[PDB]
Every structure is written in structure tokens, then in C-alpha cells.
Symmetry: C3
Subunit: 556 residues, 3 copies
């Protein structure tokens, strides 16, 4: 009896699943630790009551089952580590990319990829019918409407963290939770449902809910997603340090519109220091209102009368995000009064950025080789009256067609860099107000150029230029400077030159016939013109007093 | 007796606080693990001696008390996880922001926010008397001079990590420690003192001390702070991956000046990959010398004779920092020979950056909508002779008054982007030395412009321009080019035109009266001028040999 | 007997090394936990078989020994925390930097630093003979050819993580492993071999192998390195959130060429959000093919016939990297079709970037004060036909010699910022195609300038300019505009002026002698020239019909 007293005081308490017939039996026995040391086959909806205990759940085996294993009544501070979810069903999956990692877009080609596997692809859903037009008709019935996910559901808990989770056809659902985290996800391979979901459609708005670190792969829909979460002014929630690969829909998604009877939208979350690669749809989908065929109202949210569609004060903190390889859109937002910074998007088949934003500011944005499949009208679209400060455009891809690169018709932009085709820029105002003394350095040409283009006049033709051109060859120490203007849609049609052929003189264009009175603009100026009938140059003079006189300028 | 031998070998050792009357009793019994499984009321200054043992302290309950719970003699490698500090006192707190997250600046409005709470605000301190002028007189006595914090103090330990700490009116103090870390702080709500402090005023300079990950909220003073730490050339210390919200003073602070009898300054620390949002004072305060009313000496540090005020070789590694919503200054530094890179500051009421630096380099800085309340003279200030390479200025806010945007009078700057008002730029030298061939693309105007402004002549008026202007309307295929110069403070007063009204000729300005000899600059050039008494143009000619002659140029 | 049944169910299982004579004995007894609670002296090659068990190994003492402690047959999900490796030998180390952190380059000075220590320096290797020319002759024999490392070797394991490792003369080797991680390395001080190595020369290509977080210091060779790893399209491996200090070779290295009988190269890895400071060689060395004296083949990899040298489809994900203080090259790559973004390199003695890349894209690169010791021909070199979009050049250092800043002769570049000497730019094409309306703001001069330089003509002299110059002094409200051209290698030799001396007229240069027919370029233009024998200006006129006529323009 004496040893048992000492033993009870000196040893760490932990129960292990190998000692119990059911997970509930183990949960009931647990006091401090719970070890999952044997695989456990659960039935869909199997529910475990943890009695409000603050438990440290250490997983060293699998939870096996289609459907949801539901954890309830875990005490604040509970931790679940190393969990591995696996379905019983091996579904039919598609793999819409090649052995060289080229996206497949042809429906028949995608159908040909069908195999039964728990990974290396995903179960088709109805969004695939849109993504791969014609695939709905071509998919065999056994590959349509599948619904396989093995989901760990944390239900109505506060202060629970799931660490280093993994699995096959695996999902993680936090339903009605607060102050919960999915930490260092160990590359679970997804199933039919979202891989990581914070859903708060009932009860209080979700808060304190984060994805921190880790990564996921595959899944039929989005990798990390939020419904009805509001981080407060404290920005207590969101996604930080996360990587998503090959989402069947999007890497990171804040839901839009009405789900069930209420709002699925999200406010005041962080989206930072994260990476989304090769999503079938979008990299980051951070809008709150429905784009196509929107609801006319927002039950449970601000009414349309207060904030028009796409003008919600979402107020997310969005910074240092990278996207590569989207088959859809790299980076999507809506809202009014938004800020986003340090966003880099590369090699996307649809728009790099699709921004349904108004009175918003975008700082240091890089959109590099996007809309490569011409899925959208442009590489970056901005609907409302926004500011862009720093915009890198164009990597190494050319564009064969007529699509715009940036269409931001109400936006004021500064600091574009890259080999953009200037005819493919459309903005409200473009300006470099604060440059210093400037030098234009020309390589691979016999001239250097400072060109002007008035887009109201022509988007495709420069209206005037300042050139410097080599006289002779390399090392001559001689160039001529040229000031030009467009006429008859012919760039550089009319020009004044300084030092052509090293002559040390100015070559001055004159009106080729009798100049009309209205040709001269300013007082105390003269305009030379040709009088062919005498082989003479004349001068139309507007005198200092503004009155016109015609003089003889040069004679035989 | 046989079972006890086997049991002692096969089970993990842990003691738990529920088995002991005092925390010291539990600490003394511990060998490997220590579980805090009941709330523990501690008295201020209660000191626990852990006997040099390498302990894994797992907290699943609260430490409750005003004042400091002092942990001593923990072995290297000890870990404390999940600690939760809470005060016994519920103090009076102010909440100087509105339900729309607008800062309150009026003292009377701030006083009206007073409530008794352990969170959602902070206890006033003497710095509030400066921040909210007049508040000292208006605060009730019971809201002044409060001193409530529940602090975990790790004293004179090496290699101790505190993980996932939280609390209410909570603080964490590492006093005289080395190689200690505050890891993944779980959003403790702060009290009167700094939330996370590495203080090494006695003993060896602090080294190896980090804040890694996590976040904090509220507190009366700074969220994370350092005194007398030196990371060495190895840069072994600092703040990485951290978020601070609503510091009563600053998000991250390296102390300045003398504290007690010695230096509180810091060297060779990292400040990287971190975020500070809504501090009442500053985002990052990384200076070492006192700005206002500085000490005349530096006991315990380099003397003023070796390094003048603000010119210490602090040598921090500063990169990838974000600040939004400061009521004070976003980003502050001093030092000589400093580097900072990839700093983004948005929506601050005081200066975005206040840099008391000399011979320092700033790369890729973005200061976006700051000094919004005109608290300072500018949005970014630099005192000494520094280099800025990449500077984004202006989001969507206008400035109504006369404040400068950048005042860096000794600095050389390149790569400004944004809709800056050029009259609000003051630098030593501004240049784009390495641009390629250039095109100026104009949207929303009937002209395109390349302007020149000589700030010595005028900060507010362009001194000359190269324009292209539409002739006719859109699609005309015709424009005129114009070269202009300022006269009588009237921009574009004098100009030469090419192709005005599609005339295909150059319109040339002439001197409106008899030209003085000194009007002509160069040899082998001529200057037309008006002789009104004969209705003639004359030419003042400087011949190739440099001698002047006056010729008749155009006649009736 | 009843208590033993209950005890076996309610307590956590862990064995501890203090109860066993050998580590294998402890490993054999272990079921769940294993505690290292006494220092353990191991012999080189001592091999522990963990029986496929999923073990949680908690280290609170040292593994002491020169050579490798080899862990085998650990179950997937096994974790080793807090491990501390230490050599038995205290070797001779060099410390090639001063007490002011200046690099020592002189061999004799480096030899003078020799001391016996397990840290604060490194054991010389053969690469030091190249790095410090002449040192091979000057090093005492007892400091050459040393081979001290205490290495934890994880051999042929899947799903094993080493967390918070540290040590002295310490190394960590994952040999033939997959899905293994080195997490939050706690600043181990390195020995002779790489500090963290994933080597997969035998068996399947390495995959799922990461360095996540943490830091290392010293070591004779590279801090983190990979051999024959391929992360797949999923990019499942690499280095994220890591810091390397004072690598004896490089911070992060993907091996090049043949090692043994097969390829050591790597594909599809992540290199992100990491920092390398003060490497003796390079910051990030991410090439796959050997630069100097390359192999003529690639056994085990793509043949040269498929992909030429330096043109492998390595396809790494490279983003948000910082390097400071390299004695060699900051950032090195090779490959074809590569992308890298958001790379910042400061204060390197060799090139900031050395890029043996083709058809690759570099976005937002900052190379700030590099090649400071003229070790290479330039600060950034690019061999093949690449695109650079955003390139910051020059901090505060000057260059005294003739070295180029960027030499990227086949590359097209846009968006250079900084005080680069334009004569030190060499690229295929440099352009700013998409700027808006422009203003050149001049500070510290009596003029503002927009210059043109045709590098084919001269790399050192501007070929033409548009100036604005003050007339009178500050506040005069008057300037003159000047359009210039180079002649006889004299910049600004020939010019047209508008408003010189506030005269309100254009000063027009004329040919100083009789103009040749070929001097005039365009029809409907005239060229003034001097007839000295009559003191007359003439006009060489190209009439609207293209025929030449000579007229009298101005007469006495
Ligand atoms: Ca005449």
C-alpha cells in the first residue's frame, strides 16, 4: 500500500487506447495524457465526450473511417498531436496535370487520368464541370458525386490545438470553435471536403482560430477555409506561415455569400507569410460577396443599403503572400478601404490578381507571367477607385492576342516595372511624380529614347519622342538629338534635329505650304513656312502684342 | 517488491501540484516532469528553487497573484509550457479607440472609456499624460499610478524556454538570463509592465535571448523589450515571427540610455519577420540613445567621445517588418553604419519612419499613409547622411497642410514610387541613374508630360517640360511636342513647339525686344529678336570665332 | 496484483538511460518514451536498433563521441527532442574575422588565430587553401586534415523528426531517409562535416526532407545541405525559416555534380524565408552542375544531350531570402526555366548574385554593397538569356576600380533603382516601357537633367540631354531649357536653348561652315549654316518635294 501512494504521486498519468474497446472508454478513463497506440476504426458521427478535461492526446496510430470522428467537451488547453485520418473507401480520382507538370485543360484528357487511389489526385465535384468544360458528360457515373473524407471534427470547443496532423483522404473541421489552432499540419492528403475548416455558422462569430505553419496537398476543394469568423480589431485569427499544394479548388478561402440561413463571410483575419502552389482554382480567395449571380441581401451581416456589393469593411491584414501555378486566379479580393502588401504571383493560367475593391491600396505587387491561358480578360483587374504603389509586370512570357495586362480603369498607379506592352495598360492615371534626375540607358540599339504616349489619342502609337541617335558608328563620339511629333498616325513624322551627321546645327521643320493664321500658338513666336512660287521661306509671326504679320525669312 | 522495481523503470516521472501544499514542495519532489493541475495563488516575490534540475513543466491551470512569481535554478534545457498568469486585482483601464477602431486623441473622450477590467484596455501610466494632453488633470485619482501585473520571472537561468504562455494582466520577465526564449506566446493580455522582457542590467550582457513566434495584446507599455543584450556577431537574439497588438507603448523596444547606474542599450539583435499593429506609441523602437534631453554620458557603454549621440554601431539585423495603425511612429532607429530592408508601414498617426541614423542604408522601404494626424513634421525623417534605395510613398490619403512627406536633408535617395507631392520631398540628392529607354504613358489627359523641377529654384513650380499634346481629338493621329521654360514664376511661359495644329513645322520663340549681347550663350549659334520699329526679326549671332554680330533675319 | 493492473493502465510509459548500461539496452526496453537523463559516451559507428517502434525520445543530457551515433529502425512518427552532440576531441580551429567583425583574408593573419576549441571557429579543410591563398604552406601540420565531428545519423528511416538539437562540433545526418525533418535547430556549433545533411545517394530519391526553423553556427563546411533529393511537383522538401551563421563553406547548399558513382543533384525543393549571415563561401548555393572543370556526363541524372550544363529543370521554389556578410557569393543558382523572387543580399566580399541561368526570371532582387573585395568581375552576373524585373543596386559603398556592377549580357532588365554608375551596367536590353507622366526632381544642383546614353556609342559619356538650368539665383522664377548632343566625345557640345538669361527666345545652333548636302535629313526642313565670306547665315533647304536648295537666311 505504501508503494502505491508514492507511485501515484511520482508518475505521469496517461491512458492508452490499446487498453480499451472504444475511444469513449479511453476518453472517460483519461486524466492527463491519452495515447492512441492502435489503429481505431470509427463509424461516421462517432462522438467522444472528453468531460471538460484538459487532455494531451498523443497519436501514434490511425483513425480509420469514412465520415466524421467528433471530439467534444475538451478543456481549454487541450492538444492533439500527430493525428492521422484515413478513409475506408478508395475513391476514383482525377489528376489534371502531366508528368512534366503541365495542366491538362481538355475534359477527355482529364477523364483518361482516372484511377482508384486515396491520393495523387482528387474526387471530381460539380466545380470540375465548370473548370473542364464537357467533363460532366464524359465522366463515368462512378466518378461523379463521390463524397469520401475522413474528418476529425472538433465541435464547440475553446482553446484546442491540433498539431502535426496528417492523413489520406483526410479533413479537419473545427465547428463552432474559438481560440483553436491547426498547427504545423504535416501534409495531410485531402478528401472531398476542405482540408482545414473553421466553420462558425451557429453561435458566436469565430475568433482566435488560426492555421499556423505546415502544409496540405490535394483535396477536392479548398485547403484552408473560414466561415463566419471575425478576428476583431486585434486580428486574432487567419492563416500564417502556411503552404497549400494542388487544392482542387483554392489554397486559402474566406467564404462568400449566404450559407444556409446566414452569412459565411469573414472579417479582421490575417493572411500572411504563406504560399499557395498549383491550385486548380485560386491561390488566395479573400472576397466576401458573391461575384456571379449575387444574393440581393446579407442575412446575418451588414445590409446592402449600408455597404454595396463588394464594399464590405473586411479589414483583413494581408501581407507577404506567394502564389505559383494556379489554373485559376492567383489572388482575389473584394471590399472597400482594404490594404494588401508584398504580394507575388507567378505563372497562373488565369488572372494573377482579380480585385473587386474600392478605395483600397495595394503596395509592392508583382504579377509575373499570368493569364497564360487567356481564361480572363487581363492579368490584373481592379474594379473600383484604388491606388497601386509598385507593380511588377511581365516575366518571360509573350502574349499573342489582344488581352490587357492591367485593366484598372478607376485606379491611380505608380511604379510599374517590367517589359509590359504599353498598349495593354489601362488605368485612370499613371504617374512618376517623385523621380530624381534621370538617365535613359540604351543597350542593343543605335539610339536611346524617351517616348511619350497619350492613351486618349492612341494606345498603340507614341505621340512624340526625344531621341539620341549615333552619328557614324561606335566610338565616334558623336550623336544627334531629335524631338519628334506624330502626324497622320505615323510616329516621328515631324521632327527637329540637333547635330545630325555631326553638322553642329539644328535642323528645323517648316510648314510645307502657306501657313494658316491659326497654326501659330503663342505671342512673340514665329513659324516658318514654304512659298513654293518664289522658292522662299516665309515666317508667320505672332508679334509680342499678339497681332499677326507675315515676313520673308529666306530667299534665293 | 518486484513490481516496484519494474514500475520505477518503465514509467515516466512527473509530479503534480495537486499533491502538494506549495509550489516549492512540488518543485523539490520533481525529477523530470512537473504538472500544474490546480490553480495556484502565489504571493508577490514567492521564489521557487528548482535545484538545477532539467524539468519539463506542463501547465494546465493558472498562477494567480499580483506581483512576481520567481523561478530560479532551472537546469539548461528546462521548458515551461502553457503557463497562464492572472492578477488578483481588477484595475481601471482606458480604451482609447472607438467601436469603428478609430483612435481617440481627446483626453476627455479617453477618460470616458474608463472601466474595471483585466483586459480590453490598459492601466494609464505617465506616458499617457504626454500622449493625451490634459488627461493627467482629468483622470480620477483611482485610475492614476496603478501597478497591476502578474509576472512570471525567470531569474538568472540559462537555456530555459517558455512556450505557449498566456494570461490576463500578465507579464513575462527574464532577468539576468541567457539562451532563453519566449516561444509561441499565446496572446497574453498585458498588465502594467512590459509583456515580454529580457533584462540584463546586472551580470554579463544578455545573449541568446529571443522572442520567437506568437503574439501579445494590450499592456500599458511595450510588448517585447530588451535591456543590455548583445547578440554577438552571430546575432544570437532578438525577435522573429512575432505579432504585437495594441501595446500601450511600443510593439518591440530596445531600451535607450541609462537605467539605474548602467546602459540599457542593445547590440547585434535580429528584428525580422514580425508585425506590430495599433501601438499607442511606436511599432518598432530600435534606437539606443535618448532623443529628448539625452544623457551626456553612457556608463557601461561606449563613451560619447568614441561614438556621438545616435551613432552607436548597433549592428542589428532588421528585415521584413510590417507596421499598421500606430498612434505614434511606425518604425524608429538610430545608429551609424546601420542597414534595414523590406520595411512596410501603413496608416500611422505619426511618422512612418523616424531615423536618427548616419552612414546607413535603407533598402525597399514602403511608407504608406502615415503622419495622418500631423503629430510630426513629416512621414519619414532621416537626420544623417544615409542612402535610401527604393521608397514607396503615398497610399490613398491626402495631406491638407504644409508638412513634408520625406525630410532626409543629408540623404541620397533613388527609386521613389507613388503619388507624392514633389514639393513635399526634401533630400540631399535624388536620382535614377540606371533607367533604360523610357516611355511616359498618360491616361485621363489630352497630353503627356516629362517635367523638370529644380528645387533650389522652386519646390512648388516645374522649371521646364517636354510635353506631347493632342491636335484635334482622339484618333486624329496627330499631336504636337512642346519644349518649355519657366519665366516670372509662370510655368511653361516660354516654349518651342513642333507640329502645333498638325502644321508640320517648328514654332520658335523670339526675344520680344532688342536682345542684349549677353543673352546669347554659345558660339556658332543665333538668337532671333524683334525690331518693332521696322517690323523685322533680327538675329543676334555669336559667330564660330565667338565674336558677336547682328543680322536681319526676316523682313516685310 | 490489483494495483499493478491499474498502474499499467494509468501511467505513461517511458524508460530512461540511467537504468541501462548501453543505449541499445534502453532502446530495446522502450515502448513509448525514452529519456536520455545521463551523458552517454558512444563509439564511432555505434548503432541502435529501435525495433520499428514509434518512440518519443526526450534528451536532457549529452551524447559524447567523435564519429557517428547511428539510429536505425525508428517507426514513422518518432521524434527526438533536445539532442546535444559533443566531440571528445578539442581540435585546432581558425577564426578568420577580427574583434570588429572584419573578415581576415591574409593567410598569415588567419594562421595567427589558431586555438584549440570546440567552437568560435572551424577546422581548416582543403577549401581553405583556395579561400586564403598561401595558407596551405603556412598552416602547421596539426591544423591540417582534422576530421572532428560528433554526428547523429538517422539511417534509412521514414517520418522521423529531430527537434531543438544542439551541440559542440556537432553534426546531424539523415542518410537514405524520407519525410524527415530537422526542426528548430537550437544553434548547434558545427564540426568538420555539414551541420545538417539530407543525403540520399542510395535508394530512392529523397523526398519530404526539410530544415524548418532554427539556426546553426560555425562548422567547416555548409550549414544545411542536400544530396539527391527531389521534392516532386508538390515541392515536398527544402529549407524554410532557417538561419545560418558563419558556415565554413555555405549557408544552404544543393550539391552539384557526381558524388561517388551517381548524381548529388536536387530538384523541386523550397528555399524560403531564410537568412544566411557571414558565410566564408556562399549564402545560398542552389546550382546543380559543376562550374569549374565540370563532368562531361551526369550518371543517375539527365544526360548532357537532353539538358546542357547549367540548364537542368531544377524547378526549386525560391523566395524571400536574405544574405549579409558573405566572404564569397551571396546567392548562386543555375538551371533553365527558373524563377526566384524577393532576394536581398547585403555586404558581400564576392558577387551578390552569380546566376548561371537561362530562360529564367528574377523578380524584386536587391544587391546592396557586394563584391566589396573585388573577388569577382561584378556584383551580379547572369550568363544566359534571362529577365530581371526589379533590381536594386548600390548601398553606400563606392567602387574604386573598373569592375562592372551588373553583367548580364543576354538578359533583359527593367526597374533598376539606386546610385549605380551607368558605365558599370551591361545588359542585352534595359527598358522602362510602362512609366506614367514623369517628373525629374533635382536637389543640390542649379539644374535638373534627363540624360540619354547609347552604350554602343559610349558606356561612359551621355550622348544627349534635356536640361533645365536656373537663370539668376534661387527664387528668380526663371530657368532655361537646353537640348544637347555629343560631338567629338564632348558631352553637351552642341545645343539648342530656350529662355537663356530669361530672354524668352530660342538660341539655335548653326553649322559653322558651308553645310554639305548630306547634312540635312528630312524633307520640308531647313538647316542654317555660316557663310563667313559675307557675314551671312544661309539655309540648306530640303524642299517638300525632297530636292535641295540653298537660300540666304540672315544678312548684314
Ligand atoms: Ca532672312
Amino acid at each position: 500500500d505504501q508503494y502505491s501512494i508514492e507511485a501515484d504521486k511520482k508518475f505521469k498519468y496517461s491512458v492508452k487506447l490499446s487498453d480499451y474497446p472504444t475511444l469513449q472508454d479511453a476518453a472517460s478513463a483519461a486524466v492527463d495524457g491519452l495515447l492512441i497506440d492502435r489503429d481505431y476504426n470509427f463509424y461516421g458521427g462517432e462522438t467522444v465526450d472528453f468531460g471538460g478535461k484538459v487532455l494531451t492526446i498523443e497519436c501514434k496510430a490511425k483513425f480509420i473511417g469514412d465520415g466524421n470522428l467528433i471530439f467534444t467537451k475538451l478543456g481549454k488547453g487541450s492538444r492533439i498531436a500527430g493525428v492521422f485520418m484515413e478513409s475506408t473507401t478508395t475513391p476514383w480520382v482525377i489528376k489534371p496535370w502531366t508528368d512534366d507538370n503541365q495542366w491538362l485543360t481538355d475534359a477527355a484528357a482529364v477523364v483518361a487520368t482516372l484511377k482508384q487511389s486515396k491520393t495523387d489526385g482528387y474526387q471530381p465535384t460539380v466545380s470540375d464541370y465548370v473548370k473542364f468544360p464537357g467533363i460532366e458528360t464524359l465522366l463515368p457515373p462512378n466518378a461523379k458525386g463521390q463524397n469520401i473524407t475522413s474528418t476529425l471534427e472538433i465541435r464547440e470547443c475553446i482553446g484546442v490545438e491540433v498539431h502535426r496532423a496528417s492523413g489520406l483522404m483526410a479533413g479537419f473541421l473545427f465547428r463552432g470553435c474559438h481560440f483553436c489552432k491547426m498547427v504545423d499540419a504535416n501534409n495531410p492528403s485531402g478528401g472531398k471536403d476542405g482540408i482545414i475548416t473553421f466553420e462558425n455558422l451557429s453561435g458566436d462569430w469565430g475568433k482566435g482560430n488560426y492555421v499556423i505553419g505546415g502544409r496540405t496537398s490535394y483535396g477536392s476543394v479548398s485547403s484552408a477555409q473560414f466561415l463566419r469568423n471575425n478576428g476583431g480589431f486585434e486580428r486574432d485569427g487567419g492563416v500564417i506561415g502556411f503552404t497549400s499544394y494542388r487544392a482542387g479548388e483554392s489554397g486559402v478561402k474566406t467564404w462568400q455569400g449566404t450559407v444556409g440561413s446566414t452569412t459565411s463571410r469573414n472579417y479582421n483575419l490575417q493572411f500572411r507569410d504563406s504560399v499557395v502552389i498549383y491550385p486548380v482554382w485560386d491561390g488566395f480567395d479573400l472576397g466576401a460577396d458573391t461575384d456571379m449571380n449575387p444574393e440581393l441581401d446579407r442575412p446575418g451581416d451588414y445590409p446592402i443599403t449600408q455597404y454595396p456589393l463588394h464594399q464590405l469593411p473586411l479589414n483583413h491584414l494581408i501581407d507577404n503572400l506567394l502564389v505559383r501555378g494556379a489554373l485559376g486566379v492567383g489572388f482575389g479580393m473584394d471590399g472597400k478601404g482594404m490594404y494588401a502588401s508584398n504580394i507575388t504571383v507567378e505563372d497562373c493560367a488565369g488572372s494573377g490578381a482579380y480585385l473587386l475593391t474600392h478605395e483600397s491600396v495595394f503596395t509592392n505587387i508583382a504579377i509575373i507571367d499570368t493569364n497564360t491561358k487567356d481564361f480572363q480578360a487581363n492579368q490584373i483587374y481592379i474594379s473600383g477607385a484604388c491606388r497601386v504603389n509598385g507593380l511588377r509586370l511581365i516575366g518571360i512570357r509573350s502574349t499573342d492576342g489582344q488581352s490587357l495586362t492591367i485593366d484598372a480603369p478607376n485606379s491611380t498607379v505608380s511604379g510599374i516595372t517590367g517589359m509590359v506592352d504599353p498598349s495593354r495598360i489601362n488605368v485612370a492615371n499613371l504617374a512618376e511624380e517623385g523621380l530624381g534626375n534621370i538617365r535613359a540607358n540604351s543597350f542593343g540599339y543605335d539610339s536611346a529614347a524617351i517616348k511619350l504616349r497619350i492613351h486618349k489619342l492612341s494606345k498603340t502609337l507614341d505621340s512624340g519622342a526625344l531621341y539620341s541617335h549615333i552619328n557614324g558608328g561606335a566610338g565616334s563620339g558623336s550623336a544627334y538629338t531629335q524631338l519628334t511629333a506624330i502626324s497622320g498616325s505615323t510616329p516621328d513624322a515631324v521632327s527637329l534635329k540637333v547635330n545630325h551627321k555631326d553638322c553642329r546645327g539644328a535642323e528645323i521643320p517648316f510648314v510645307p505650304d502657306i501657313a494658316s493664321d491659326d497654326f501659330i500658338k503663342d505671342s512673340s513666336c514665329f513659324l516658318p513656312y514654304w512659298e513654293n512660287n518664289s522658292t522662299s521661306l516665309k515666317a508667320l509671326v505672332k508679334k509680342p502684342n499678339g497681332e499677326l504679320v507675315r515676313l520673308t525669312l529666306a530667299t534665293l
